Amino acid sequence: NKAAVVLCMDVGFTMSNSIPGIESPFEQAKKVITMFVQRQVFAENKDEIALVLFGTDGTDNPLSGGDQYQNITVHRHLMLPDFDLLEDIESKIQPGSQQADFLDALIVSMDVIQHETIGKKFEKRHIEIFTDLSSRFSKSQLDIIIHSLKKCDISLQFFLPFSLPFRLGGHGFPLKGITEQQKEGLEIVKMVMISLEGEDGLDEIYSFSESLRKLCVFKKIERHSIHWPCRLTIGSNLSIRIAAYKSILQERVKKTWTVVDAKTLKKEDIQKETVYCLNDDDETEVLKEDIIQGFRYGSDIVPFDEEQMKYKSEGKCFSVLGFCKSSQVQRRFFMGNQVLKVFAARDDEAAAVALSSLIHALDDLDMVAIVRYAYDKRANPQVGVAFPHIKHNYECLVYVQLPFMEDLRQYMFSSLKNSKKYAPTEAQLNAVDALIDSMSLAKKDEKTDTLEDLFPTTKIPNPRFQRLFQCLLHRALHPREPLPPIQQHIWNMLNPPAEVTTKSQIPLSKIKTLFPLIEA
């Protein structure tokens, strides 16, 4: 329900070091940080955010008593994020001249949580550190640091200038090209994360650039989705208690644009008045008292013992109709705007086993279940598929709605294979065969017998929001200036690796010549 997040940002001198063409660590961190705060603000989440800074020229923090935890500043204490925080990140806050002890910052960051959460109720306390691990630090605190993080249940994440031509946010620095100090800091970071989450913990160390094309900064604070309880039934004598979760559901712009007066900028003054009148000439006006409804039925017009003739459903359900070869239920038929994952009711070992049987039973015979789905009593029944999905950590059925006959639009199309008019030449075929090879967005790399996606579009966030948020913000801070251009790192993440573009050139050229194309 609520999360307390501390953004511990390195602002030290080396953060400003700028290599020709490449944004400096400070500028990248500033970008990632703003991406986080923007989201929290325009989304209206009530997660509280504190911002710590280490490397500031001065010292402003609760633990500074005695020339300690120096150059660490708690720029912002725990509290909802507002535009005043955003404006502080762009303008106000700038790069420092000093180099604070990175673990000291962490401790100060931990202290903000600990003390400032007492009177409140948070479900998750999380800390995000952005730094280049460029300077010295005392390992002496590690002891207390770890143990406290564990006892207090504060989770952690690190964002660095590298990973474990440069395009910010693209899909393209040797651990040899980093300083030795950086290497030493990284070992302590790597350790700390291993002690907190083990192996997987290493996946909590990101690079600023990859963070722009991921939602990883929001990972530890996403609001779990509630389950749907129901009985998967086979016949009227077999019953299995299940729980369904929206696995896939398109995220949409939530807030809407309110129409206001160009000057008062108020809504009250504005009012839409929808009136009715005779459609054909002699356009007389009509009165509500004198207006009925009714539906069309071809040329017929029926004024619609009436509503009382609406479909009557037995209500909520998830009953099996039958099973069948998976191959017969083709993906091109999938419909609806969601994907449900069905599991056995929580803490019901019996059901767990019951469902497991079914799941494996389907994966084996290579079949699937055609089922009737009904969310609640008022819901319109559905017919869809439930197919097995087995993994390392769990097992379940993926439900996806199928079509009703009236949804089918069957148009015939001319075979292009048997077309003597269009059949491509051998010169043309190999030409394309060449292109496809060059534009491969995958590679049988590393674990030799393994395939690696080079362009995981489903790991990229919808460029829709960051765009919108950017604009919204730019208007809040710069009311007079016109909306800004899309940010490069957003364009860079929506484009494929540079390799692909390169390898494609020549092939494409040949394909240009070999395939004539002229507009009618």
Partner: protein, 548 residues
Amino acid sequence: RDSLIFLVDASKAMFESQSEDELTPFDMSIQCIQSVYISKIISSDRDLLAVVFYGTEKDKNSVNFKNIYVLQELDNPGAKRILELDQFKGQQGQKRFQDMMGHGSDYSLSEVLWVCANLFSDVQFKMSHKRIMLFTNEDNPHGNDSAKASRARTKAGDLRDTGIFLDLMHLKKPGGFDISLFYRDIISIVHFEESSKLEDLLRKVRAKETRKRALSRLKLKLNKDIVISVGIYNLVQKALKPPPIKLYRETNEPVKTKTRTFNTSTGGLLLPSDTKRSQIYGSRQIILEKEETEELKRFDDPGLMLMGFKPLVLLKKHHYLRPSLFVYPEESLVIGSSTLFSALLIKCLEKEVAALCRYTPRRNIPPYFVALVPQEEELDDQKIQVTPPGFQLVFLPFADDKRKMPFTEKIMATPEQVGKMKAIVEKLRFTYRSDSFENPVLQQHFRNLEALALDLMEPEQAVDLTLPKVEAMNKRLGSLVDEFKELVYPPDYNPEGYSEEELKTHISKGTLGKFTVPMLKEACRAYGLKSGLKKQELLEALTKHFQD
């Protein structure tokens, strides 16, 4: 508006069932027509339909031609029209037809072709398509009158020139139905098989009752320049329950709805430039011109930008986001496309790879990465095209569309259980086909709506096919149920009522040596193993305690 004339052969053969528990070709024909009528009404389509029989005894056509009866002229589908056609369904309806327009009569297709060609002219609207669908189980109508047979071929040839197209819904006849004896030089342009069952006839009719309608046409740019035009089609589209319309209570007439916004204080009607856009976040108001609300969505210009090719394996079935579209070449805009497109479809199929593109429908809309999955053509036994050739445009979700899920512990079933479930799965096997179920609600709605438009006593409560045939499933399952429960449900079940791991990892990752000595002690204290005062000691120990 598209026009469609349904031409039905009323010869005596058409009323003889081919010795099966199947219907007579006439009956099939009639019923497939009531279907197309009802189909059009459901999708609220504005197409024009007509009904014409030939080879009848009586006649009714503009120029009193003989043996030709025009039951219904080109017009929109209505309750009464369907009711009328329905009066000729079934055996009893066959008599009704026989009596009214006695079958088995002389005739000549030219005269018939003319009447239909004529029903079009009479139309007072503009028509996007002019087709005639001929239902006949007679393959060589004028094989004995080498003159009529000639007028008919000519007359047909003329219709094509006028833009009128005829499709042959040939029905079964003893011995088969040779298309090459006549209709060969008559139909417009392998061909469909002869229909002997109402099931295949409808499938054949449905496959031609409508004409290709693209959702749009876009530039599928392989790069800035190399571009081909394609048509985007939506083969699947949730059929909605049309909303009611408002009527002038006295004349039950449609009523347009104007919408006028205005300033309340000055009573003045507002123009688009007298209002700006707003959104508030806390104590912060943000104002943008309407032009800007749209400006901030603009990325690519409309089209399909190629991003590369990815092995179909990486595309996941459970990664569904929204219905898929169909991509076919649009030779009309950019000539040569059908070729480039065809090559791609051929190579993507060979390489089992889909083409990844940044899709943008209309202007000002965020892009979406989609997968153009290669799709091979497929025809069934009746030569009906089940799956067209081209590309399945598949939407891929953005990170925001994925909702991750926490898990409890995995509790797997035993091979004996999977066994019993497998058995159950097979007893309930069946062949799924996309046209299997009708929408319960839509049916109910329109069925009632019909009954009412026909001042009928009451409506026809449809039969929900989407419901599970319980008694059946039960019977077919036998003891398997009770035998399955035994394997999984305890007899008293409420069916309806520095841990070793960590440290072992630090060693593998070489981070143990980065431990402070206090951390090292506590660790050795926990395994109460013989330690030291030095770090290397504690280090050697702990490592040895695990690995050595």
